[PDB]
C-alpha cells in the first residue's frame, strides 16, 4: 500500500486507500514506530538478487493484490429463491484479469459449484453466506500456498550438493501468549505451547529415569505426562472443545450461544480443568476458563464459528489449475469432503506432524524473555517478568528437578573434601556420612553417584565453612 | 473410524464413507437372471447379474426389484445387493466400518429387525444404526423446522419437524411414487401404438419419463394448447431406431401426483396431503412450516413441480401468509448428504448399536431407547 | 446498597431495583416442558423453558403456572422462576441485595414461611421482607386513606385503609380474576364454532381478551343493540390467518366480574363487595373511603370499567354522597412502583429481616412483629 513503488500499484489496480478493502480495513489501518517503505525496499532487494528472477516476484505481487481484491463482491440473493448472484461485476473482472481467469467462469463456479456424484456431475445451490465462506477459504488457502511455495523456492535455492548426515534443528515458536481478550488464535497458540511443554516434561522424565537405571534405584517412578495430559484431553480428545466446535460448524442452525451452551453441558463439572469464567479487574467479558500450565486463562466465544469454517470450493480450484500464471505451481495437488474442512483440523494435523518430526531428535531447550516493555534496560517490570517466568515454566522445571534427589556428588571427592564438617571406598564414605549425625532416610546409597535430598548438601557445606 | 453410510432407498442404491458430500457408488437396485438356454460352451455365465451389469445385459435377463414400496419382499436379493455394494463397488471390509442405514417411516418392525440381523450376523459390522429419510433430508438442507416432502421411487411421505421436535401424529405416507408413474406412462403410451411389456422395456420407459416429462402449471389450458398446436411434441431415440413422438403424454404422466384418480387411487394429491399434514400440527407452528416447505427425492425433480405445488398450496393456504418451497438442485442425493453429515457428528458416536449390546438385548434392540 | 423489589403476582413476574420509576424486567411466569421426543440429535435442547422463552415455543411445549390463586402450588417451578429472574432478566447476584417480596392478603402461613425459607437458603439474601399488595398500591397513588382494589390475574382483594391504619376485619377476598375470565372466554368462543383447548391456545385467547374485550355500561341495552345492529363485531387475526370475528362475546367476558353467577360462582359482584366492605367499616370514615376508591391490577384495565363501577356504587350509595374512582393509566404496574417507593424510604431500613435474626428465630419470625 506504500506509494513509493508506483509500478505495483499501477499494475495491481489499487486506489492506495487501505479503507477500500474489507480484508484490511476491519483492523488497524496504520501504526507509528514503523516505516514499511524501508521494509519493502529490503524485501524486494532480497527478492531481486536471489536464486529466482523478478517476473515471479511480479506474479506474487499480482496474487496478493487479487487477495486484497476479493473483499469487494456483493453476491446479492436472487428473488423468490435461495440462490446467490453477483452484483459488482467489476472487482471480479479485475481478479480474473490478475489471475488470467475468465470472469464469467469464475462467477459461475463460485455461484454454482459442481460435485461428482457416482459417475455423473450435479450442481449445488449456494446462498450468500456459503459463497462468502467459500471465497474467504479460497483467499486464505491461496495465501498459505503462496507462502509455502516461496519457502520451498528459497530452500531449493539455499542447499548445496554436499552429502547430508544427521542435521541440527533450530526452532523458534512464540510462548504462552496471554492477553485480556483471548480468542481462538490465542487458544491455538496455547495448545501448541501446551504440547511443547508436554514434550519437555516427557524428555525430562526420560532423562531422570535413565539416571535412575544407571544408578539402579528408581525414585518416584511416575511419568509426568499424566500430570499434564488433562488439558490436552480437554482440548484435543473427542468431546473436547475443538471437536465440539468442529461438529457445531456443520450443524444446520448453530450460533455462538449454542456453542457455549453445549460446552457447558458437556464439560462444566465433568472435568476439573474446565470451570466458570471469572470477573476480575473489570475485564470486558469472558465465557469460559481453563487452568492451563501457567494459570487460569479466560477466553471469548464470539467469532469462533465464522473463523473456523474452511469450505474449499473445488470448481474454483479446477479453474485455478487452468490459469496462465503460477497458480498451477501453487495448486499442483488438490479423502475428507471439501465442506468438512476446518482450521482447527489442519492446525491439529500440522501440530501432530511437527511433534512426530521433533520426537526423532534429542531436544535442547532455550528460554528467552523480554525484561522491559520499553527499550530502556535500566528499568524492568516485576509483574511482567513474573508472568513470563510462570508461562515459560522455568520455576516449574526446577521444582520438577528438585522433586526427586537432584543433589549428586562423587564418593571419593565427598570423602576427601566434606570430612571437615565435623573435624576431629563405599564403606568408608558410608561410615563418614553416618558419623556426621545424618538421618538415614534423607540419603540414598548407590555405587557411583549418591542421591541426596535438596538442602542437605547446602547445610553440610555451610557448617563446614564455619568449622574451618 | 471412517464410518460407512448407505441408502438402500428404492430403485437406486447409493453408498459411501461419512464426511463426504457425494456418494461414491450409485447404481440401480436390480437383480437379474438369464431366461434363455445358452449354447456357447466354455464361457461359464454366472447364475445372477446384480447391479449395473444387469443393465448392460438388460436384453437377455429378467430384471427384478427386491423392494416394492420400501419393504423388502425378496431378502436373498437383498443380501446379494449388500454384498455387491460392500465388495464390488466400495472394495471395503465391513468388519471395521460402522454402517448407517436409512429407512422409511411407517414400516413393519420385522423389516428393521431383519436388517439388523443381516448386518450383525452375516457381515459382522461392529455397529450400525437405522434412521428416517426425512430427518436426514432436513439435515442436508441446513434447516431446523419445516415440513419435508420426500418422494422417491417406492413411497412418498411428509414429516413435519419444528425446532428438532417431530410431530408423529401428522406424518402422512402415500404409496404413489415413480414406479406407478412409469406404469401409467406405459398404460398411456399404449394408445399411440407403442407397446412396452417386458421388464427390459421398463427401463426404456423410465428413461423416457426422466428425459421428456414435465409438470404443467395448468392442466386444462395445457390440454387445450396441446390439442391444437404441435409445439409440445418431441422425438425419442430407442436403442435401435424407429423414433417415437410423444405429445400430451409428457405432462399427463406426472399429473398423477396431483390427480391420483388417474390410476384408480382414492387418496388426494401431494399438494393436498402436505396442506393436511400442516393443518394437523399446532396453530403456533404453522407459519414456519408454511414458510419452510422442503423438497427431496428423485421424483420431485420434474421441471415445474415446485411452481405447481406452490400455486396449489397458496390456493389452499390463507391469503395473508407467504408460501416458500425450497427445491435445491441436488434433491436426489439430499438424503445421503444428510446421512453423511449425521454420521460425521461426534455426539452421534454414543448412539451406535454396538455388537455387545445387540448380543445382550436380542434383535428387539432397535425399538428401545437406542433407535 | 441497593434493594430489589419483586412482584411474583400470578402469570406476570415484574422485578427491578429500588428507586427506579418502572420495573426493569416483565415476563410471564410460566414453565414449559417439551411434550414431544425430538428426532434431531446433537442440538441438545434444555429440559425446561422458563419465562418469555417458553412463549416463543408454544407449539412444542406445555405451559404450567406455578401459582393458581395467589398461593404457590409447585415450588420447584417457582424456584426456577426466581433463579431465572435473578440471573438472566436482571443479571445481578442476589448475595448482597435485600429483596422485597409481595403477596395477597388472606393466604396460608405455610406459603409465606416457605417463601422466606427459600429466599434465605437457596439464594442467601442478606435480608428480605414481605408486603401486602394493597399497601404498595396505596403508596403509588400518593394517598393515605381510601380503599384500594387490586384485581390481578389470580385473586381480587379489597383492602380498606384510613389515615394509614388498616382495618383487617373489613378485608374481602374474591378468587374471581383474569384467569377465570379467560376460561369463560374459551367456553363462550365455542358458541361461535371456535375451539381453543390446548394450553398454548390459552395465550391466544388471553390476547383476544386483552385486545378486544370491553365493559358495557348497561348489559341489557348492549344486548339489544348487538342483537339488532352489527357495529359491535370486530375481527382478530389468528397466528395462521383465518381471521375470526367476535360480536356479543365482546362484553360478556368482563361481565363475570359484575355477574359472578355466569361462571357458577355464588358470591356477589365487585361493585357489591366494594359497597359491603365500605359499610363494614366505621361510620365516621365512610366519606373519605367513598371519595377515594382506588383501582389497580391488570384486570382493571378494561375500557369503561371505571364508569360502570361508579354508576353501580352510586346506585348503591346514598344520593347525597360523592363518589370518585381513581384509575391512573399505570394501574398494572402500580404495585411495583409502590414497592419501590416503600423500599426507598429511610425509615424502612430498620424493618428488614436480617439473616442473623432469621437464624436465631426460625422461619416463624416473619409472622412476628417483623412482618
Ligand atoms: N430428472 C428426473 N426427472 C423425472 N424423474 C426422475 C428424474 N430423476 C429420477 N427420477 C425418478 O426418481 C426415481 C429415483 O428415486 P430415488 O431418488 O432413487 O429414490 P430412493 O433414493 O429412495 O431410492 C426413479 O425411479 C426415476 O423415475
Ligand atoms: N388491557 C387489558 N384488558 C384486559 N385485561 C388485561 C389487560 N391488560 C392485562 N390484562 C389481564 O391482567 C392480567 C395481568 O395481571 P397482573 O397485574 O400481572 O396480576 P399480578 O399482579 O397478580 O401478576 C393478565 O392475565 C391479563 O389477562
Ligand atoms: Mg428416497
Ligand atoms: Mg397483583
Coordinates of C-alpha atoms in Angstrom, one line a residue, chain B residues 103-345:
Chain B
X103 CA -35.3 -46.4 6.4
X104 CA -38.8 -45.0 5.6
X105 CA -41.4 -44.1 8.1
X106 CA -44.4 -46.3 9.0
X107 CA -42.9 -49.7 8.1
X108 CA -43.2 -53.1 9.7
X109 CA -40.9 -53.6 12.6
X110 CA -39.9 -57.0 11.2
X111 CA -38.2 -55.1 8.4
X112 CA -35.8 -53.3 10.7
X113 CA -35.3 -56.4 12.8
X114 CA -34.2 -58.4 9.8
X115 CA -32.0 -55.6 8.6
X116 CA -30.2 -55.5 11.9
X117 CA -30.0 -59.3 12.0
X118 CA -28.5 -59.4 8.5
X119 CA -26.0 -56.6 9.3
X120 CA -24.8 -58.2 12.6
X121 CA -24.8 -61.9 11.7
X122 CA -23.8 -62.0 8.0
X123 CA -21.5 -59.1 7.6
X124 CA -20.5 -58.7 11.2
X125 CA -20.4 -54.9 11.3
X126 CA -19.1 -53.6 14.7
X127 CA -22.0 -51.2 15.0
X128 CA -25.0 -49.9 13.0
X129 CA -27.9 -47.5 13.1
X130 CA -31.2 -47.0 11.3
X131 CA -32.6 -43.5 10.6
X132 CA -35.5 -41.8 8.9
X133 CA -35.2 -40.4 5.4
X134 CA -36.9 -37.1 6.1
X135 CA -34.8 -36.2 9.2
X136 CA -31.6 -36.8 7.1
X137 CA -33.1 -34.7 4.3
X138 CA -33.7 -31.9 6.7
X139 CA -30.1 -32.2 8.0
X140 CA -28.8 -31.8 4.4
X141 CA -30.9 -28.7 3.8
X142 CA -29.4 -26.8 6.7
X143 CA -32.7 -26.2 8.4
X144 CA -34.3 -26.9 11.8
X145 CA -38.1 -26.6 11.0
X146 CA -40.4 -27.1 8.1
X147 CA -42.4 -29.9 6.6
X148 CA -40.3 -32.0 4.2
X149 CA -41.7 -34.0 1.3
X150 CA -39.6 -37.0 0.3
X151 CA -41.0 -38.6 -2.9
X152 CA -38.6 -41.3 -4.2
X153 CA -39.4 -44.4 -6.3
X154 CA -41.1 -46.5 -3.7
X155 CA -43.1 -44.3 -1.3
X156 CA -44.0 -40.6 -0.8
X157 CA -44.2 -39.3 2.8
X158 CA -44.4 -35.9 4.6
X159 CA -42.8 -35.5 8.0
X160 CA -43.3 -32.2 9.9
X161 CA -40.4 -31.0 12.2
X162 CA -40.3 -27.9 14.4
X163 CA -37.2 -26.9 16.4
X164 CA -36.0 -30.5 16.1
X165 CA -39.2 -31.9 17.6
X166 CA -41.1 -34.3 15.4
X167 CA -44.9 -34.4 15.1
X168 CA -45.6 -38.2 14.6
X169 CA -49.4 -37.8 14.6
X170 CA -49.1 -35.6 11.5
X171 CA -46.8 -37.9 9.5
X172 CA -48.6 -39.0 6.3
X173 CA -47.5 -41.8 4.0
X174 CA -48.6 -42.3 0.4
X175 CA -47.5 -45.2 -1.8
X176 CA -47.7 -43.2 -5.0
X177 CA -44.2 -42.9 -6.4
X178 CA -42.1 -43.1 -9.6
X179 CA -42.8 -46.8 -10.3
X180 CA -46.6 -46.0 -10.5
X181 CA -45.7 -43.1 -12.8
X182 CA -43.7 -45.4 -15.1
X183 CA -46.6 -47.9 -15.2
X184 CA -49.1 -45.2 -16.1
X185 CA -46.7 -43.9 -18.7
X186 CA -46.8 -47.4 -20.4
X187 CA -50.6 -47.5 -20.0
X188 CA -50.9 -44.1 -21.7
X189 CA -48.3 -44.8 -24.4
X190 CA -50.1 -48.0 -25.5
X191 CA -52.7 -45.7 -27.0
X192 CA -50.3 -44.3 -29.6
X193 CA -49.1 -47.6 -30.9
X194 CA -46.1 -48.1 -28.7
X195 CA -46.2 -51.3 -26.5
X196 CA -43.7 -51.9 -23.7
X197 CA -44.4 -55.1 -21.9
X198 CA -41.1 -56.8 -20.9
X199 CA -39.1 -55.8 -17.8
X200 CA -36.4 -54.6 -20.1
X201 CA -38.7 -52.0 -21.6
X202 CA -39.5 -50.9 -18.1
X203 CA -36.0 -49.3 -18.2
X204 CA -36.6 -47.6 -21.6
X205 CA -40.0 -46.2 -20.4
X206 CA -38.3 -45.0 -17.2
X207 CA -35.6 -43.2 -19.3
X208 CA -38.3 -41.6 -21.4
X209 CA -40.0 -40.4 -18.3
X210 CA -36.8 -39.0 -16.9
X211 CA -35.8 -37.2 -20.1
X212 CA -39.0 -35.9 -21.6
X213 CA -41.6 -35.4 -18.8
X214 CA -42.5 -32.1 -17.1
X215 CA -45.3 -30.9 -14.8
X216 CA -47.6 -28.2 -16.2
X217 CA -48.7 -25.2 -14.2
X218 CA -52.2 -25.6 -15.5
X219 CA -53.9 -28.7 -16.9
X220 CA -57.0 -27.7 -18.9
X221 CA -55.2 -24.8 -20.6
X222 CA -52.2 -27.0 -21.4
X223 CA -54.5 -29.7 -22.8
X224 CA -56.2 -27.1 -25.0
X225 CA -52.8 -25.9 -26.2
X226 CA -51.5 -29.4 -26.9
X227 CA -54.8 -30.5 -28.6
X228 CA -54.4 -27.7 -31.3
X229 CA -50.7 -26.8 -31.6
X230 CA -47.9 -29.3 -32.2
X231 CA -45.2 -27.4 -30.3
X232 CA -45.3 -29.8 -27.4
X233 CA -44.3 -32.9 -29.4
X234 CA -40.8 -34.3 -29.0
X235 CA -39.0 -37.3 -30.5
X236 CA -37.0 -40.0 -28.7
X237 CA -34.2 -42.4 -29.8
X238 CA -35.0 -46.0 -29.0
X239 CA -31.9 -48.2 -28.6
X240 CA -32.4 -49.5 -32.2
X241 CA -34.2 -46.7 -34.1
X242 CA -37.8 -46.1 -35.0
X243 CA -38.1 -42.6 -33.4
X244 CA -41.3 -42.1 -31.4
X245 CA -43.1 -38.8 -30.9
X246 CA -44.8 -38.1 -27.6
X247 CA -47.4 -35.4 -27.4
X248 CA -49.5 -34.6 -24.4
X249 CA -48.4 -37.8 -22.6
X250 CA -45.3 -35.9 -21.4
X251 CA -47.2 -33.8 -18.9
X252 CA -50.1 -36.2 -18.4
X253 CA -47.9 -38.8 -16.7
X254 CA -46.7 -36.5 -13.8
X255 CA -50.3 -35.3 -13.2
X256 CA -51.0 -38.5 -11.3
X257 CA -49.1 -36.9 -8.3
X258 CA -51.8 -34.2 -8.3
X259 CA -54.7 -36.2 -9.7
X260 CA -54.2 -39.8 -8.3
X261 CA -57.6 -40.8 -9.6
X262 CA -55.8 -41.4 -12.9
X263 CA -54.5 -44.8 -11.7
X264 CA -57.6 -45.5 -9.6
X265 CA -56.2 -44.4 -6.3
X266 CA -58.6 -43.0 -3.7
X267 CA -56.3 -40.6 -1.9
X268 CA -55.6 -36.9 -2.8
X269 CA -52.6 -35.3 -4.4
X270 CA -49.4 -34.4 -2.7
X271 CA -50.4 -30.7 -2.8
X272 CA -53.3 -31.6 -0.5
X273 CA -51.6 -34.2 1.7
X274 CA -48.9 -31.6 2.5
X275 CA -51.6 -29.0 3.4
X276 CA -53.5 -31.5 5.6
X277 CA -50.3 -32.6 7.4
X278 CA -49.5 -28.9 8.1
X279 CA -53.0 -28.3 9.4
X280 CA -52.8 -31.4 11.7
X281 CA -50.0 -29.6 13.6
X282 CA -50.4 -26.9 16.3
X283 CA -51.6 -23.4 15.4
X284 CA -48.4 -21.7 16.7
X285 CA -46.0 -23.5 14.3
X286 CA -48.0 -23.4 11.0
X287 CA -46.2 -20.3 9.9
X288 CA -42.7 -21.8 9.9
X289 CA -44.0 -25.0 8.3
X290 CA -45.7 -22.9 5.5
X291 CA -42.5 -20.8 5.0
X292 CA -40.0 -23.8 5.1
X293 CA -41.5 -26.4 2.7
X294 CA -38.6 -28.6 1.8
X295 CA -38.5 -30.9 -1.2
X296 CA -36.3 -34.0 -1.7
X297 CA -36.3 -37.3 -3.6
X298 CA -35.7 -38.2 -7.2
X299 CA -39.4 -38.0 -8.2
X300 CA -39.6 -34.3 -7.2
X301 CA -37.2 -33.4 -10.0
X302 CA -39.8 -32.8 -12.7
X303 CA -39.4 -29.4 -14.3
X304 CA -42.1 -27.2 -13.0
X305 CA -43.3 -29.3 -10.0
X306 CA -42.2 -26.7 -7.4
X307 CA -44.2 -23.9 -9.1
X308 CA -47.3 -26.0 -9.4
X309 CA -47.2 -27.2 -5.8
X310 CA -46.6 -23.6 -4.6
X311 CA -49.6 -22.4 -6.6
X312 CA -51.8 -25.1 -5.2
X313 CA -50.7 -24.6 -1.6
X314 CA -51.2 -20.8 -2.0
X315 CA -54.7 -21.6 -3.3
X316 CA -55.3 -23.7 -0.2
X317 CA -53.4 -21.7 2.5
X318 CA -54.8 -18.4 3.8
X319 CA -54.1 -15.4 1.6
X320 CA -52.3 -13.5 4.3
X321 CA -49.3 -15.9 4.6
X322 CA -46.3 -16.3 2.4
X323 CA -45.6 -19.7 0.8
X324 CA -42.0 -20.7 0.0
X325 CA -40.8 -24.0 -1.4
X326 CA -37.2 -25.0 -1.2
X327 CA -36.0 -27.0 -4.3
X328 CA -32.2 -27.3 -4.3
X329 CA -30.6 -28.8 -7.5
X330 CA -29.4 -31.8 -5.5
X331 CA -32.8 -33.2 -4.3
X332 CA -32.0 -36.7 -5.4
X333 CA -28.8 -37.1 -3.2
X334 CA -30.0 -34.9 -0.3
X335 CA -30.8 -37.9 2.0
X336 CA -27.2 -39.3 1.6
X337 CA -25.7 -35.9 2.3
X338 CA -27.8 -35.6 5.4
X339 CA -26.7 -39.1 6.4
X340 CA -23.0 -38.3 6.0
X341 CA -23.5 -35.1 8.0
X342 CA -25.2 -37.0 10.8
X343 CA -22.6 -39.8 10.8
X344 CA -19.7 -37.2 10.9
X345 CA -21.1 -35.7 14.1

